[PDB]
């Protein structure tokens, strides 16, 4: 009634960026698709000359 009455008396907000580091970029990209063919070409050339041992030993 008196004394104190003179003054006065959720779910999901879904953030995303959190506490990780900063990020950067560059545009000098992508030789790498050539080596996948270099590697599998030269791999064949190994077997090709293993065959050239065998095809001369068989003579």
């Amino acid at each position: 009634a008196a004394a104190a009455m003179t003054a006065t008396r959720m779910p999901s907000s879904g953030s995303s960026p959190s506490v990780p580091s900063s990020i950067i970029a560059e545009e000098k990209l992508l030789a790498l698709l050539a080596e996948l063919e270099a590697l599998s070409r030269q791999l064949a050339a190994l077997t090709q000359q293993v065959s050239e041992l065998r095809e001369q030993q068989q003579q």
Binding site: L30, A31, L33, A34, L36, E37
Partner: protein, 49 residues
Amino acid sequence: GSIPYLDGTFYLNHTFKKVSIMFDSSVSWPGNDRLLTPNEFEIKRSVDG
């Protein structure tokens, strides 16, 4: 067996890599900077940078 040349059963179309055309031994066709590489019609490529 089937005779593709006579009956139309063509099955080796996937074996082409490229075709180039050249009139008069000089003028590459279609030329005119049309395609991404048509001084040659590149049908398919084994590696794609």
